[PDB]
C-alpha cells in the first residue's frame, strides 16, 4: 500500500518496500517530524512499515481530528489482557473505561491527594539534603525517579514506602520490574503482533487488588469493573506517573539551572506565596502563576509523548481532504511546539510565552503537551500537581547549578522515549 | 480466554489450551454442530483455537442477531487486497459495497440474464447427450462444473466459451486456477494471519477489467468503485457461482435419482409448463412450484454454507443473555435444518415440506440456506434461477438413475466444504 499517498496526491518521503520510512528514524522520531514539517509543509504521509501515517499540522484539521470527529471517525489509537487498558481500549469500551475513571481524576479527588504526595516531597528533600551536604552534584533521575515511584504507588495503592532508602520492600522491587528493538521491529513488522509484561507481575498486583478488594483502586471501584480491568488501569497509571514525572522533572530542573534568573524568580514566587518554607497546599499551588509558566514552558520544549495519534475508522473528508479508513492520523506535537510559524525563537526557553498577557495568543491545538479532545490525557491535573508540589518543596530548600558533568547543551535520547541523552546531573546547594 | 464461557455460565465442550475445540472437527464441522445441539441444547460455546464462538439456535435470538441488531452489534463476519470483497468488507465499507451491488442482483437484472444462461443449459444437454449415448453413467461434477464455470464467466464477463469442449481457452484455464490445512491451522493459529491467490490471476482479471473499463462489471460500474474493488467482487462471484452451483446440482440430482417418484413428478411439471421441450424463461421458471419445492428441500438437507457467523462488535445483551464483544455468534444452519424439534423425519427427502400448504409452518430463521437479514446471500435469486434453468433443460431431456458406482447412502465430505464424499455418478437415459 506504499502507493497510497501518491495516489492521494499527498507528499512525503519515499517509502521503501516493507520498511516504509522507518530508516528515517535514525535521527529520532522527533527530528524526522521536524525535517518533515520543514520540507513537505502542512500535511505529509509516511509509512511505518506498511502502515500509512498521515501527519497534520493545521489547527482546524487538528481540532477536527481530536475534538469534532472524535467519536465518529478518530476514536482510537493504533493497537500495535492489557486490551482493557484505557489508553488501548476502543470505542464503546474505551468510553466505558473513561466514564468510570473520569471522577477518579476530578480536581476534587486531587485536592484530597495533596497531603499524601506532599509528604513524599518532604522525603525528596531529605534525600536531596543527604547529597547536597556531601557538597557535590546529583543524578536527578535517581532522586526524581525515587520520588515519582514513591508517589505513584501510594496514590494507586496506599503503601507508604521510601524507594531510595528501602532497597527491596517487596512492593518496591516488583514495581521496579518494568523494563525500542520491539517498537521498530513492530513498526515495520506489526504482523507478528498476533504471536506474542511478566506474568509474575500481573499476579502480585491482581493478588494485591485483594487487599483492596476487601487509593485509585477504591475510587475506581467507586458492565462490572473486572478486577483485571482494574489491573490494566493501574499499570497504565504506574507507567504514566513514573517515567513521565521523573523525565519532566529532570527537564525542568535542567532549564532552571541553565536559567538561574528563572529559577531564583521562581524561588521568589514560592517564598511569597509560601513564606518560610510553608507546606504547599492545593489552593496555594494554583496561585503560583510563574510556576505554571515554568511548567508549561518546559512541556512546550519537551512534550514527552512527542506525537498524538488517531486511527481513521471510516473513509471521511475533513476540512477538504480525504482520509481513507485505517490511516493513522498523527499530530507531531514536538515539531509543532518548535515551529517558527507559531513560536518566537522556538529553541529558546522563555516562560513568558504563557504569561497572562501572551497566553491568549497560543492556539490550544498547536500546543498539545497533554493532547486535546475527549481522549486527551486523563491524568493531566494530577501530573501537573505532582510535579508542581515537588518543585515547590525542592526550590523552597535548594538552588540548582550546572557542573562539569552537566551536559550542556542537553542532547535528547535517540530512541523512542523522550529523555535526556545523558542523565541530568546538577550541583545542589542548600539555600 | 478459555475460561470465558464457564465464566458466563454457558455450557460447551471443554476447550483444550491453544487448540480450543478443533479436535472435535474430525467428525466434520456439521456433525460437531449436531452433536453439540443434542447435548448442550439451545446455546453453547466453543473455542476455535483461542477464538470463542457462541452457537445460538433460538429463532428469536437468531432474528436478533441477523436482522434486528445487525447494523449495531453484529455487522461483520470474522476476518480470519481482498479486504475489499463484499463478504469480508466491514461496517460502512460493506454497506457501501452492498448498496452498489444491490441493483446488480435485482429480480430485474436477472430476467435479462435468462437468455444468456439458458444457452449454457443447451450446452449441458449436448455434453450430457454425448455421455448418455455412450450408454453409461456420468460424473455429475464434471458436466455440472463445466456448466457452472461456463455460466459464471459469461455472466460476470460476457465471454462465450465451452469449458468441457474448449480445453484451454486462455480465460478458461485461468478461471480453473482457483485451488482445509490452512483453515484448521488458521482456526487454531489465526495469529499468523498477519504474515501471509496467485498474483498472476488477479492481474489477468485486473487487466481483463480493461476490456470492460472501455456483464456484472458494467452493472457494477453502473467514493469511487476502485477497479481492484471491482476485481474483489468478481472473484467472490466466481467462487460463489462455481463451487456452490455445481455442488447443489449434484445434491439435487442425487435426490432426484434416489427418488424417481419426485423426479418423474418434476418432469411432469416441466412438461406441462414447458410443453415439448419448450425453452425455459424467467416467468416460466417462477411458475414451477414443485421445482421450487425440490430445490428448497435439497437446500434444507444440504445448506452448502453450513454455518452463518456474526462478530459481536460491542458488549450487548440480546433476548436476555450477555454477549461480550469479539465473540463470534454462529447459527448452525446444517444442524438446525436437521432438527427433529422443527422438522418431521429430518433425514428424509420430502419436498412436500415446502408445499403452499406447509410452507407457512416453517420458521424463516430456522431455515436459512441463504441466511437472512441485510447481510444474507446477495446472489440468492441468481443462484436459484441458475440452478432451476439447468434442471429444467436437463429433465426436459433426460431421466437419471443410480448405478453400481452410485454411493448410496450419499456420504458427506469430512473436510470444510459441503460436497459429496464420493462424486455423484448416475446413469443417464434419454427420455
Ligand atoms: C507530565 C506528565 C504527562 C504528560 C506530558 C502526559 C501526556 C499525555 C498525552 C500527550 C496523552 C495523549 C492524549 C491524546 O492523544 O490526545 C496522554 C494520554 C493519557 N494519559 Fe498522560 N501524561 C502525563 C502523565 C500522566 C499521568 C500521571 C497519568 C495517570 C496516572 C496519565 C494518564 C493518561 C491516560 C489514561 C491517557 C489515555 C487517555 C485515553 O486514552 O482516553 N498521564 N497523556
Ligand atoms: C445455491 C448457491 C448458494 C448458496 C446456498 C448461498 C448461500 C449463502 C449464505 C448462507 C450466505 C451468508 C449469509 C449470512 O451470513 O446471513 C451467503 C452470502 C453471500 N452470497 Fe451466496 N450462496 C449461493 C450462491 C451465490 C452466488 C451465485 C452468489 C453471487 C454470484 C452469491 C453471493 C453471496 C454474497 C456476495 C454473499 C455475502 C453478502 C454480504 O456479505 O453482504 N452466493 N450466501
From Swiss-Prot, chains A, B:
The coenzyme or cofactor needed here is: heme
Instruction: Quote the annotated effect of residue 157 to S.
Output: In allele CYP3A4*17; exhibits lower turnover numbers for testosterone and chlorpyrifos
Q: State which pathway it belongs to.
A: Steroid hormone biosynthesis; Cofactor metabolism; retinol metabolism; Steroid metabolism; cholesterol metabolism; Lipid metabolism; fatty acid metabolism
Q: Which GO terms describe its biological process?
A: aflatoxin metabolic process; alkaloid catabolic process; androgen metabolic process; cholesterol metabolic process; estrogen metabolic process; lipid hydroxylation; lipid metabolic process; long-chain fatty acid biosynthetic process
The chemistry this enzyme catalyses reads: an organic molecule + reduced [NADPH--hemoprotein reductase] + O2 = an alcohol + oxidized [NADPH--hemoprotein reductase] + H2O + H(+); 17beta-estradiol + reduced [NADPH--hemoprotein reductase] + O2 = 2-hydroxy-17beta-estradiol + oxidized [NADPH--hemoprotein reductase] + H2O + H(+); 17beta-estradiol + reduced [NADPH--hemoprotein reductase] + O2 = 4-hydroxy-17beta-estradiol + oxidized [NADPH--hemoprotein reductase] + H2O + H(+); 17beta-estradiol + reduced [NADPH--hemoprotein reductase] + O2 = 16alpha,17beta-estriol + oxidized [NADPH--hemoprotein reductase] + H2O + H(+)
Keywords for this entry? Disease variant, Endoplasmic reticulum, Fatty acid metabolism, Heme, Iron, Lipid biosynthesis, Lipid metabolism, Membrane, Metal-binding, Microsome, Monooxygenase, Oxidoreductase, Steroid biosynthesis, Steroid metabolism, Sterol metabolism, Transmembrane, Transmembrane helix, Ubl conjugation
The effect annotated for residue 298 to M is: In allele CYP3A4*11; unstable form
Instruction: List where this protein forms a coiled coil.
Output: none
**Outcome when changing residue 185 to P:** In allele CYP3A4*2; exhibits a lower intrinsic clearance toward nifedipine
Mutating residue 236 to T: what's the consequence?
In VDDR3; 10-fold increased activity towards calcitriol; no effect in protein abundance; decreased activity for non-vitamin D substrates
Q: How does it sit in the membrane?
A: Single-pass membrane protein
Top-rank EC class of the record's enzyme: oxidoreductase
The tissues where this chain's protein is expressed are given as: Expressed in prostate and liver. According to some authors, it is not expressed in brain. According to others, weak levels of expression are measured in some brain locations. Also expressed in epithelium of the small intestine and large intestine, bile duct, nasal mucosa, kidney, adrenal cortex, epithelium of the gastric mucosa with intestinal metaplasia, gallbladder, intercalated ducts of the pancreas, chief cells of the parathyroid and the corpus luteum of the ovary (at protein level).
What is known about its processing and modification? Polyubiquitinated in the presence of AMFR and UBE2G1 and also STUB1/CHIP and UBE2D1 (in vitro).
Give any Gene Ontology cellular component.
intracellular membrane-bounded organelle
Q: How is its activity regulated?
A: Activated by cytochrome b5.
* GO MF term list: 1,8-cineole 2-exo-monooxygenase activity; 1-alpha,25-dihydroxyvitamin D3 23-hydroxylase activity; anandamide 11,12 epoxidase activity; anandamide 14,15 epoxidase activity; anandamide 8,9 epoxidase activity; caffeine oxidase activity; enzyme binding; estrogen 16-alpha-hydroxylase activity
Record's disease association: Vitamin D-dependent rickets 3: An autosomal dominant disorder of vitamin D metabolism resulting in early-onset rickets, reduced serum levels of the vitamin D metabolites 25-hydroxyvitamin D and 1,25-dihydroxyvitamin D, and deficient responsiveness to parent and activated forms of vitamin D.
What's this chain's function?
A cytochrome P450 monooxygenase involved in the metabolism of sterols, steroid hormones, retinoids and fatty acids. Mechanistically, uses molecular oxygen inserting one oxygen atom into a substrate, and reducing the second into a water molecule, with two electrons provided by NADPH via cytochrome P450 reductase (NADPH--hemoprotein reductase). Catalyzes the hydroxylation of carbon-hydrogen bonds.
PANTHER family per UniProt: CYTOCHROME P450 3A4, CYTOCHROME P450 FAMILY 3
Spell out the note in the miscellaneous section: Chimeric transcripts, characterized by CYP3A43 exon 1 joined at canonical splice sites to distinct sets of CYP3A4 exons, have been detected. All are possibly produced by trans-splicing. The chimeric transcripts exist in 3 different combinations: CYP3A43 exon 1 joined in frame to CYP3A4 exons 2-13, CYP3A43 exon 1 joined in frame to CYP3A4 exons 4-13 and CYP3A43 exon 1 joined in frame to CYP3A4 exon 7-13. The longest chimeric isoform (CYP3A43 exon 1 joined to CYP3A4 exons 2-13) exhibits 6-beta-hydroxylase activity, while a shorter isoform (CYP3A43 exon 1 joined to CYP3A4 exons 4-13) does not.
Into which family does the record put it? Belongs to the cytochrome P450 family.
Q: What is this protein called?
A: Cytochrome P450 3A4
Q: Which organism is this entry from?
A: Homo sapiens (Human)
Amino acid at each position: 500500500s506504499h502507493g497510497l499517498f501518491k495516489k492521494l496526491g499527498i507528499p512525503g518521503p519515499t517509502p521503501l518496500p516493507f520498511l516504509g520510512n522507518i530508516l528515517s528514524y535514525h535521527k529520532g522520531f522527533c527530528m524526522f517530524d521536524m525535517e518533515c514539517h520543514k520540507k513537505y509543509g502542512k500535511v505529509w504521509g509516511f509509512y511505518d512499515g506498511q502502515q500509512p501515517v498521515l501527519a497534520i499540522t493545521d489547527p482546524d484539521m487538528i481540532k477536527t481530528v481530536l475534538v469534532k470527529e472524535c467519536y465518529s471517525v478518530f476514536t482510537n489509537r493504533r493497537p500495535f489482557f492489557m486490551k482493557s487498558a484505557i489508553s488501548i481500549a476502543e470505542d464503546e469500551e474505551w468510553k466505558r473505561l473513561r466514564s468510570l475513571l473520569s471522577p477518579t481524576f476530578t480536581s476534587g479527588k486531587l485536592k484530597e491527594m495533596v497531603p499524601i504526595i506532599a509528604q513524599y516531597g518532604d522525603v525528596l528533600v531529605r534525600n536531596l539534603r543527604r547529597e547536597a551536604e556531601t557538597g557535590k552534584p546529583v543524578t536527578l533521575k535517581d532522586v526524581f525517579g525515587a520520588y515519582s515511584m514513591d508517589v505513584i504507588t501510594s496514590t494507586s495503592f496506599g503503601v507508604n514506602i521510601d524507594s531510595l532508602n528501602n532497597p527491596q520492600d517487596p512492593f518496591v522491587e516488583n514495581t521496579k520490574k518494568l523494563l525500542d528493538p520491539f517498537f521498530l521491529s513492530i513498526t515495520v513488522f506489526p504482523f507478528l503482533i498476533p504471536i506474542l509484561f511478566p506474568r509474575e507481575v500481573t499476579n502480585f498486583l491482581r493478588k494485591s487488588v485483594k487487599r483492596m478488594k476487601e487509593d485509585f483502586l477504591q475510587l475506581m471501584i467507586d458492565k462490572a469493573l473486572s478486577d483485571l480491568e482494574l489491573v490494566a488501569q493501574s499499570i497504565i497509571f504506574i507507567f504514566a506517573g513514573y517515567e513521565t514525572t521523573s523525565s519532566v522533572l529532570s527537564f525542568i530542573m535542567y532549564e532552571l539551572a541553565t536559567h538561574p534568573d528563572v529559577q531564583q524568580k521562581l524561588q521568589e514566587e514560592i517564598d511569597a506565596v509560601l513564606p518560610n518554607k510553608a507546606p504547599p497546599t492545593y489552593d496555594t499551588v494554583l496561585q503560583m502563576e510563574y510556576l505554571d509558566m515554568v511548567v508549561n514552558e518546559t512541556l512546550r520544549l519537551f512534550p514527552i509523548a512527542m506525537r498524538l495519534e488517531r486511527v481513521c475508522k471510516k473513509d471521511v473528508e475533513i476540512n477538504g481532504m480525504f482520509i481513507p479508513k485505517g490511516v493513522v492520523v498523527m499530530i507531531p506535537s514536538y515539531a509543532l511546539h518548535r515551529d517558527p510559524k507559531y513560536w518566537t525563537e522556538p529553541e529558546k526557553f522563555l516562560p513568558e510565552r504563557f504569561s497572562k498577557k501572551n497566553k491568549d495568543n497560543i492556539d490550544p491545538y498547536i500546543y498539545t503537551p497533554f493532547g486535546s479532545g475527549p481522549r486527551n490525557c486523563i491524568g493531566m491535573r494530577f501530573a501537573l500537581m505532582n510535579m508542581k508540589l515537588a518543585l515547590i518543596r525542592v526550590l523552597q530548600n535548594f538552588s540548582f547549578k550546572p557542573c562539569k558533568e552537566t551536559q550542556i547543551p542537553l542532547k535528547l535520547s535517540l530512541g523512542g522515549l523522550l529523555q535526556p541523552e545523558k542523565p541530568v546531573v546538577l550541583k545542589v546547594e542548600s539555600r
